[PDB]
Design a protein around this ligand. Structure first.
Ligand code: ADP
Ligand code: MG
Ligand code: ZN
Lengths: 594, 587
């Protein structure tokens, strides 16, 4: 009852060996395997498109039938490595194969990863939300029987199981050195928050990582995993066995369409001087006034340029803004507009995401009693924006945690015996209404809310917006509010209001989002004239500090540099200009001097 | 009367059917749809039962009488037609994929109550509103088992679709068998809870709930709170096998009713008539009846030029006494409202007022259930003991009344449930929520006719502020600010009340007299608010006294019960003392 030989498996193995046997051709894969041997790794990365070119039928077989074809490919790879080098092949029991390249339809996202892909190779792209501790897993256990002087072996693989006694009840003692254990980890992948409609429910796919793939992923990392999607033993829980995991750049690029790029270029070249002013005016048309606040929010959206030095320093290019003001002001409305406009922004409150809070957390699953490092809102906001409401109501533990992310942009957690240092570089836009309302211009903003004044130091811009009872200002605000409320759509007959739906100069909000997303890619650089001007302006600000907001210091200098870079991005200029520096300087003057 | 003959009939219907005319051509609607879908990643179609009946009424009769078997035949026919239409598939794609046939009908819906067991295994079409949804899991349809001892294998064991169990053979080692997931074929799977529409609920009756099963692409198309109509096979494990879902993405009356409503609007005292005519059975009401009327009619859910929307609903709070008859008033108003849900802050429901995600142990799987707010979307939510909400409910209600949406979060992804419900809350004595209540008060026409008029006006007329009325309100707002307090949010609340008042009369615009009436109601609320600042004061004087507490505590130090008692004896409210203590802890 044992398969003597298989023709299909032999054919597949020989074909894969021929493919890897790249010597009569460019030799790309032979060089790859040689470099693999030299590097001591044991996972070859294979471009599926090359296999399709060499043999479309073989690639189709591999994609449609994953387990058997990959087993044959691994066999062929091990044979080829042995042929090139026998001792190295003997060093490692098995050599794995990792796929790569374009996948016609198997390239999906967790939302679109339907059950029809079971047993098919898939290329799932998403955001890592939960990770498990690296744990050894026995794949082959060797036992010894002194009574019978007999060594037995057992394989578990995909298949009280742990043998302990001989068939005659003679004790068996394990041979730990001979047995085979491989490191094993489990993670979860979800669709990118930006491109994930709210109507649908969350779609999370589990991923299993083994060997070198174990630690090549962390929570809050946008990763593409190519693997085999299989059903666990029995309703059938489904998991994806990872063949290769690659972290894709979080910045990515605005693919959009050539028409959108042309429109953006035309808009930029139309009036570069006033482009920032027009965007600020159109940022939140429903809100009247607060012009400088809108400009600062736009600067935050565009963000500065992160500088990394040879000494490992990571001077942050993000811009953090805090809004303090009496209730019944557009703070929350401004945050909503930022969410609707920012290319990649995530909302949150002082409490933060339930359980995980704002930053990452360690949670016992409580379904199997297993620890999991779950990413928080701040971590998922990496290289994006986090809009915090009721920032004052943040918990004390979160009050301490936010410090590390604000300072260095990375959150470190060692509690529960779990070590992790997750990237959390994210511009933060927080709004906190003063305690007991009715902000008093006597106490410090710290004493008005309570922040320890260290967070106030961390935030680049702190805008105090008070509900002054000026009849002229009140008339302007009331006129704007009533004009907005009376506004009727271009097509309507003064009839019914918008029907209840089951689905959730001035530039369009979507167009503004696209434009800022395109602009964010630019990497403007300083100019000597701009450097001298900013130095002179900083000296002037220090001088004005003589009279007795927070004092002007080097933090203000870096804030000015970041604002100048952001406004340079607004115009798409590859080099900052005196206009950008002047705009940043006047904005800072307004922020620190009403 | 042969399965093959029926499958041939379905195949010819799908591929040979013609739509249009000589002018527009006799297009093969289903053929083109299948081709387009297969060229894409859809692998499904929409079947018009009207189209099938027009083509061959006998086929529709078969589907109604025997839906499952003829549905399978129709699916196989769809597979064949898709194969022939797309015979030259590219390399790799040549493997043919199954097609899920989804069916729709123009036939009038059927009340969930009118569902006899005789229709079991008979196609039905019922409307409703979903209340809970289940995480999309994977369920096996084709399975294979192996004999652990004999090694015998039984491949492609068809599993009938539905919420059924399995069938393990008795032996070839006895019953024990091992399922081999490698070759097992599975499809998505999703259980939902559908509730009878609040319009059709019998008086004093709990709407009935049914379980719906959606497996293929038809699953994951709906979220709790949606108003939907489902065509499916009535099944009993008691549940429904879903075959087609229609979601009321937009919108959803005899001429005599319209004439009566026009007459009522034309009445000069229509405002007074409605105010007096709502609850004649209760005593001790003066302009609270008018406020409840304005709440029922509600304001206009506007869409600002930027594309955002401003809550058109009006929230009313009744602060005061347990002895008062606000329980009876809430019951009456929820009965009158076209869509009305009445609960308390301690309703004890698993979902609560807002939605909630819970792992059901019965399946150990996440189920998202919609709370009272979401169910009453577009209606009214009466909340007794609103001050006794849960912690999660207290967190949610802020956004629930702010954006009229309930936002649940899973890591990064966030699901949003539409809750455009006007809230009528009752309480005796968190405080931040009080700022978001549009109106706060301290303690003839038949009910059905009132409900019909309310629904008619709400669905037909949405008023707007006239230039004269808006200018009058603007000047009045400036005066109120100068005298002072009033906030811009209060201006928006006044605007919504004025719009509701104008809607009562079914006027496209709002007259300055309507603004004056809205201002009268808001001035009642605001002088009541002055005496509520006396009641609550949570305020220059309050700030000053809090500063006094701060100074006193600094002087004292820089048991807990004794300290609290002393400060309370010093005229300091307990809430103020607790707030000062919390603030100093934060510092
Ligand atoms: N300058 C303004 N222009 C237009 N509306 C305003 C302005 N200031 C406040 N509002 C009104 O305030 C409401 C939102 O207040 P919100 O931001 O929620 O208060 P807070 O953020 O202080 O809790 C909106 O309905 C908006 O119309
Ligand atoms: Mg707010
Ligand atoms: Zn057997």
């Amino acid at each position: 009852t044992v398969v003597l030989d298989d023709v299909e498996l032999r054919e597949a193995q020989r074909d894969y060996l021929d493919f890897l046997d790249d010597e009569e051709d460019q030799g790309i894969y032979q060089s790859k395997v040689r470099e693999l041997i030299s590097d001591n790794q044991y996972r070859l990365i294979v471009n599926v498109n090359d296999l399709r070119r060499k043999n479309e039928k073989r690639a189709n077989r591999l994609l449609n039938n994953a387990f058997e074809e990959l087993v044959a490919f691994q066999r062929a790879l091990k044979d080829f490595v042995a042929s090139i080098d026998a001792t190295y092949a003997k060093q490692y029991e098995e050599f794995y194969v990792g796929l790569e390249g374009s996948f016609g339809s198997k390239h999906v996202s967790p939302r679109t990863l339907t059950s029809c892909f079971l047993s098919c190779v898939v290329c799932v792209e998403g955001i890592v939300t939960k990770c498990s501790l690296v744990r050894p897993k026995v794949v082959r256990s060797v036992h010894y029987c002194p009574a019978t002087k007999k060594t037995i072996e057992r394989r578990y693989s995909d298949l009280s199981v742990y043998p302990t006694k001989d068939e005659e009840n003679n004790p068996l003692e394990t041979e730990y050195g001979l047995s085979v254990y491989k490191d094993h980890q489990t993670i979860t992948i979800q669709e990118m928050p930006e491109k994930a409609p709210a109507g649908q429910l969350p779609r999370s796919v589990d991923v299993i990582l083994d060997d070198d793939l174990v630690d090549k992923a962390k929570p809050g990392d946008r990763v593409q995993v190519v693997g085999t999607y299989r059903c666990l033993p029995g309703t059938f829980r489904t998991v994806l066995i990872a063949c290769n995991v690659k972290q894709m750049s979080k910045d990515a690029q605005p693919s959009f369409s050539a028409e959108d790029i042309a429109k953006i270029k035309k808009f930029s070249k139309t009036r570069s001087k006033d482009i920032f002013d027009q965007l600020a005016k159109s940022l939140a048309p429903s809100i009247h006034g607060h012009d400088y606040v809108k400009k600062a929010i736009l600067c935050l959206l565009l963000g500065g340029v992160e500088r990394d030095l040879e000494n490992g320093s990571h001077i942050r290019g993000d811009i953090n803004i805090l809004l303090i003001g009496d209730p019944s002001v557009a703070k929350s409305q401004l945050l909503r507009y930022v969410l609707c406009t920012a290319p990649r922004a995530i909302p949150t409150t002082g409490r933060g995401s339930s359980g995980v809070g704002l930053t990452a957390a360690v949670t016992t699953d409580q379904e199997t009693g297993e620890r999991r490092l779950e990413a928080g809102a701040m971590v998922l906001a990496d290289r994006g924006v986090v809009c915090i409401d009721e920032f004052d109501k943040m918990s004390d533990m979160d009050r301490t945690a936010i410090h590390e992310v604000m300072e260095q942009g990375r959150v470190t957690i060692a509690k529960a015996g779990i070590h992790a240092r997750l990237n959390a570089r994210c511009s933060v836009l927080a709004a906190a209404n003063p305690v007991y309302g009715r902000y008093d211009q006597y106490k410090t903003p710290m004493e008005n809310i309570g922040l320890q004044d260290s967070l106030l130091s961390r935030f680049d811009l702190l805008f105090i917006m008070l509900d002054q009872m000026d009849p002229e200002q009140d008339r302007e605000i009331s006129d704007h509010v009533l004009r907005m409320h009376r506004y009727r759509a271009p097509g309507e007959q003064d009839g019914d209001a918008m029907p209840l739906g089951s689905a959730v100069k001035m530039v369009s909000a979507a167009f503004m989002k696209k434009y800022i997303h395109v602009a964010k890619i630019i990497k403007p650089v300083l100019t000597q004239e701009s450097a001298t001007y900013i130095a002179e302006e900083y000296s002037r600000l220090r001088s004005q500090d003589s009279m007795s907001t927070s004092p002007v210091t080097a933090r203000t200098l870096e804030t000015l540099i970041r604002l100048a870079t952001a406004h340079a991005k607004a115009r798409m200029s590859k080099t900052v200009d005196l206009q950008d520096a002047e705009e940043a300087v006047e904005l800072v003057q307004y922020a620190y001097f009403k | 009367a042969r399965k093959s003959q029926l499958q041939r009939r379905f195949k010819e219907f799908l591929r040979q059917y013609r739509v249009g005319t000589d002018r527009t051509g006799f297009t093969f609607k289903y053929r083109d749809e299948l081709k387009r879908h297969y060229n894409l990643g859809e692998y499904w179609i929409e079947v018009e039962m009207e189209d099938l009946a027009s083509f061959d009424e006998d086929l529709a009769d078969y589907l109604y009488k025997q839906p499952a078997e003829h549905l399978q035949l129709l699916e196989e026919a769809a597979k064949e037609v898709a194969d022939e239409v797309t015979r030259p598939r590219p390399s790799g794609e040549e493997v043919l994929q199954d097609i899920q046939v989804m069916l729709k009908s123009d036939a009038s819906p059927s009340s969930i109550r009118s569902l006899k067991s005789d229709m079991m295994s008979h196609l039905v079409k019922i409307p409703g509103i979903i209340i809970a949804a289940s995480a999309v899991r994977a369920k096996a349809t084709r399975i294979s088992i192996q004999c652990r001892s004999c090694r015998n294998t039984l491949t492609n064991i068809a599993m009938r679709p539905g919420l059924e169990g399995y069938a393990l053979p008795r032996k070839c080692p006895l019953d024990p068998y091992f399922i081999m997931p490698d070759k097992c074929k599975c499809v998505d799977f999703q259980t939902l809870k559908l509730q009878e529409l609040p319009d059709a609920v019998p008086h004093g009756e709990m709407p009935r709930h049914m379980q719906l099963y959606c497996d293929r692409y038809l699953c994951d198309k709906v979220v709790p709170g949606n108003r939907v109509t489902i065509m499916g096979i009535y099944s009993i494990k008691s549940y429904i096998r879903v075959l087609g879902i229609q979601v009321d993405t937009d919108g959803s009356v005899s001429p005599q009713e319209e004439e009566e409503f026009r007459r009522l609007a034309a009445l000069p005292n229509v405002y007074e008539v409605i105010s007096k005519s709502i609850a004649p059975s209760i005593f001790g009401g003066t302009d609270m009846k008018k406020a409840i009327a304005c709440l029922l009619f509600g304001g206009s859910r506007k869409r600002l030029p930027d594309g955002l929307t401003r809550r058109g609903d009006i929230n009313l709070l009744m602060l005061g006494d347990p002895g008062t008859a606000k329980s009876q008033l809430l019951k009456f108003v929820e009965k009158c409202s076209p869509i009305g849900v009445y609960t308390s802050g301690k309703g004890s429901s698993a979902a609560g007022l807002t939605a909630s995600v819970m792992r059901d142990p019965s399946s150990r799987n996440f189920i998202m259930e919609g709370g009272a707010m979401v169910l009453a979307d577009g209606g009214v939510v009466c909340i007794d003991e609103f001050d006794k909400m849960r912690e999660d409910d207290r967190v949610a209600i802020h956004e629930a009344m702010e954006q009229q949406t309930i936002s649940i979060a899973k890591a990064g992804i966030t699901t949003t449930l539409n809750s455009r419900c006007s809230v009528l809350a009752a309480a005796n004595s968190m405080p931040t929520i009080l700022s978001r209540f549009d109106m706060i008060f301290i303690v003839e026409i038949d009910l059905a006719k009132l409900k019909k008029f309310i629904a008619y006006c709400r669905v037909k007329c949405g008023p707007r502020l006239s230039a004269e009325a808006a200018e009058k309100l603007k000047n009045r707002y400036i005066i109120m600010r100068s005298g002072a307090p009033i906030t811009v949010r209060q201006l928006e609340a006044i605007v919504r009340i004025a719009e509701a008042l104008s809607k009562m009369k079914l006027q496209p615009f709002a007259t300055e007299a309507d603004v004056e009436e809205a201002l009268r109601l808001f001035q009642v609320s605001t002088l009541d608010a002055a005496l509520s600042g006396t009641l609550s004061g949570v305020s220059q004087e309050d700030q000053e006294m809090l500063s006094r507490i701060e100074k006193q505590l600094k002087r004292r130090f820089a048991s807990e019960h004794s300290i609290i008692k002393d400060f309370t004896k010093q005229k300091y409210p307990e809430h103020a003392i607790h707030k000062v203590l919390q603030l100093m802890l934060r510092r």
